[PDB]
Amino acid sequence: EVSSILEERIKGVSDEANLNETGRVLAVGDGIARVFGLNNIQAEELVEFSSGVKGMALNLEPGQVGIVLFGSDRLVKEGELVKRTGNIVDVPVGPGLLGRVVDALGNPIDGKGPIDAAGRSRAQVKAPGILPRRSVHEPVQTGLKAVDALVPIGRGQRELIIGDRQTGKTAVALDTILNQKRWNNGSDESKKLYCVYVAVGQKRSTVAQLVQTLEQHDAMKYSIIVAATASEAAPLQYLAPFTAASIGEWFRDNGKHALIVYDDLSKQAVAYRQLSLLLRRPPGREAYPGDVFYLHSRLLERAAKLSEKEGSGSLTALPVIETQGGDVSAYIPTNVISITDGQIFLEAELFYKGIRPAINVGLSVSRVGSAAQVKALKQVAGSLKLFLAQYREVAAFAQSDLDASTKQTLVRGERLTQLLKQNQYSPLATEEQVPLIYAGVNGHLDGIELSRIGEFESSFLSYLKSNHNELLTEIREKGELSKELLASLKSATESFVAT
């Protein structure tokens, strides 16, 4: 009641400004208080104002230290005491954040109370060395057929997701997370990827849609949403991926695996731009800070597959970059493209043309790719890359009097493209990815009518599920397609294809 609130204030007693250094604002304009004092002050230390505002100290100038406010201007006014928290930016890290939506400071914005986090570790921490990493050998399965075969993704690996604005960029990401529920349910902490979605500059209404969808898909119980919303201040937005990485480090360090999706670094860039411009530090090329490359690279190299002496763990990552109308040339895209090992390039034309979600796999690349891929899935998917490649070339020969060879290619290719359409927010399991691709590979879908490709797919799955759930279980458990299994599978495919 009134009593509980008053009792809370009473709990809030304790006073004395006994601090070796205090500060006094000289002038505060533009959220850049310039403080006289704070002689001792760690670099980028957290400082607490009289108005309880928190700040970092990017500029330590010789006579004054230009604090950058994380809080609202209105409260602050010149002269005010600036207490020295004495702790460089650190955020709680620990297992408590599973199924917790937290803001940048860590404060639950889903109001699930104080984090069950067992340490506070710094926002920026140097990345794993040469020997603290072992080569990738464990794939992660997104449940998106094209991604898993055409663009295979490892673990501790960072591939870009560079594509057109609000084309459900966030949707492409969210699909992966859904398949991670299945694996999450499974044991072995390597299979338990505790996903982290880093919502940067995203309005709280949008994130509310995310939160509810995640709750609907029960994803909250391994999901973490580090949230720096549109409203949240530009220091918070800037430090938001760095902060997020640290949360990931705890899981990674314990040897577990996890997937962190930084979405979108483009708005992070803008925030850094805002900071730099306000600190009068000259803005780099295309008016985006010069050492943005250094910041982004530092962030993206804290995602890695650690060595076995380092406890066999990883932090898979998937940064998202928003193209400026498909402009992949621009200082922030070019830099990021260089840093990333792989790219996924969604194509707008394809979206309109009904491949929704839309991916253009010509402009998707993996630079680690098939090194981590399901062995079964390797077997049934070399052909698919080549078939589609031919399909691209003969696409523009599809405008009259056509050679039989080209026309054959065209038929196989069109059916494949229809097959590779993905139904948003429905993931798939590898044990059901492989049969479908196998059919296409064996060209048994060449005969199947285009309209009936969609119908075929689900029907084939049900037919396999009733008739050949031995095959499905074999695929699931073996993880490799035995010649006997491929024989039986071919038979099954033929039988279903016949009907």
Binding site: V101, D103, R165, A234, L277, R280, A287, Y352
Partner: protein, 470 residues
């Protein structure tokens, strides 16, 4: 008067520095009033420069200012009056009537800046507005509580589109509306005043179902920046205190970006990318985040945006493009083709468009429409060089349907009784799904293309077929 007396030190346009004395130093974002023969100059405190010398931005005009002029402190962000009676008042930037219905009757006053509501407050939207406009209903349905965004260049009569929206959605809707005009013409102002006096949305006898805040482009840039915030708080009073659902309307939000860019430059913040303010993101963010569907009220913003030279890749439109829920791009080209609505259908998408959510049937029909149109646009190039001879019979049928659909979309509006004379066709969403479905089924592909042009629903298309027939 106030001990908090400041003396002007430098009039450098809008930047006016004031020299408050000792032990007195207004907090950031305060409001200073300076007695002048120009009434009260309102100064928004935006920096302290130390030595009890603040640097403030002017809202009102800066001519005839004499240095060392006593500055009273009204304190805090400009506080307007809000109340039940605010409906049926046109209110200038400093919160004073500009429709000479005398002083606005204050129940409460509130500051024009108000903190964005937290994650907890937000309630997840799902309600579907139905404008009765075919393109909107079928190809990008709107949602109540939404943040509709009318991206377009000039010339597409952005105001005209909104006027149709007010006629349909506002009149239909029971809740109040707030029409806010940011940096818009006094020609437009006079037209809007007249038009809504006529439509009775403003009914001077009794109250109005709308309040108006006309901020015009002649108003100094500082006022142009902070008109938006003011309008929002009026909506908040309705939303919160009166527990209403508000149809907010703002016009044109490029003026808001532009205004902020100017005073960034004046503040000495060196211009950021493409000359836009470095605080563009946070200013946009503050506006959008404040608007939400709280448990006390659902507010549906419709924000006009001016896209300079139809480059929405320009950072000011592009930044806004993320921030808004239900984009529509009204392309000049499509307007010129004679299609009114001028919406480019393949460049107009809303968050609410999710398949089952908008109806699985609705989605599938609309998907078929989109594919048909997309094919048609691509095939125009083939027709252009190669000719129509290289299009197959199937392709030709898709093209014929698309040409019919393209002009099926064309329908008149009530606000182009003025432009033309034809009275608007309010065609319900359910009816549109059916009517478009019929076309795809080819049931009315026996109807001429021009009998789809600038008319209503399927029944009407049949009637106009009869009209052309005889």
């Amino acid at each position: 008067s106030t001990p908090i007396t400041g003396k002007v030190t430098a009039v450098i346009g809008a930047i006016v520095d004031v020299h408050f004395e000792q032990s007195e130093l207004p907090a950031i974002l305060n409001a200073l009033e300076i007695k002048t023969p120009q009434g009260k100059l309102v100064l928004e405190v935006a920096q302290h420069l130390g030595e009890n010398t603040v640097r403030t931005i002017a809202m009102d005009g800066t001519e005839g200012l004499v240095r060392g002029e006593k500055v009273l402190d009204t304190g805090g962000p400009i506080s307007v009056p809000v109340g039940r009676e605010t409906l049926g008042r046109i209110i200038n930037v400093i919160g004073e009537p500009i429709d000479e219905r005398g002083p606005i009757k204050s129940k409460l006053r509130k500051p024009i800046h108000a903190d964005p509501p937290s994650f907890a407050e937000q309630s997840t939207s799902a309600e579907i507005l139905e404008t009765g406009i075919k393109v909107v209903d079928l190809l990008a349905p709107y949602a109540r509580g939404g943040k509709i965004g009318l991206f377009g260049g000039a010339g597409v009569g952005k105001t005209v589109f909104i006027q149709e929206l007010i006629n349909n959605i506002a009149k239909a809707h029971g809740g109040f509306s707030v029409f806010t005009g940011v940096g818009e013409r006094t020609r437009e102002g006079n037209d809007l005043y007249r038009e809504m006096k006529e439509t009775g949305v403003i009914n001077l006898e009794g109250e109005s179902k709308v309040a108006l805040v006309f901020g015009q482009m002649n108003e100094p840039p500082g006022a142009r920046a902070r008109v938006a915030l003011t309008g929002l708080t009026i909506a908040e009073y309705f939303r919160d205190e009166e527990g209403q659902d508000v149809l907010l309307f703002i016009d044109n939000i490029f003026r808001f970006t532009q205004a902020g860019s100017e005073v960034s430059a004046l503040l000495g913040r060196i211009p950021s990318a493409v000359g836009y303010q470095p605080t563009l993101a946070t200013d946009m963010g503050l506006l959008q985040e404040r608007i939400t569907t709280t448990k006390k009220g659902s507010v549906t913003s419709v924000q006009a945006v001016y896209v300079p030279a139809d480059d929405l890749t320009d950072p000011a439109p592009a930044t806004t493009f993320a921030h808004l829920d239900a984009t529509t791009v009204l392309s000049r080209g499509i307007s010129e083709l004679g299609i009114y609505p001028a919406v480019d259908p393949l460049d107009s998408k809303s968050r609410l468009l999710d398949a089952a959510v908008v109806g699985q049937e609705h989605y599938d029909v609309a998907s078929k429409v989109q594919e048909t149109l997309q094919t048609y646009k691509s095939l125009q190039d083939i027709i252009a060089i190669l000719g129509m001879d290289e299009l197959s019979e199937q392709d030709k049928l898709t093209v014929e349907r698309a040409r019919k659909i393209q002009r099926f979309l064309s329908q008149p509006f009530a606000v182009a009784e003025v432009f033309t004379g034809i009275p608007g066709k309010l065609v319900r969403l359910k009816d549109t799904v059916a009517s478009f479905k019929a076309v795809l089924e080819g049931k009315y592909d026996n109807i001429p293309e021009h009998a789809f042009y600038m008319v209503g629903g399927i029944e009407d298309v049949v009637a106009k077929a009869e009209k052309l027939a005889a």
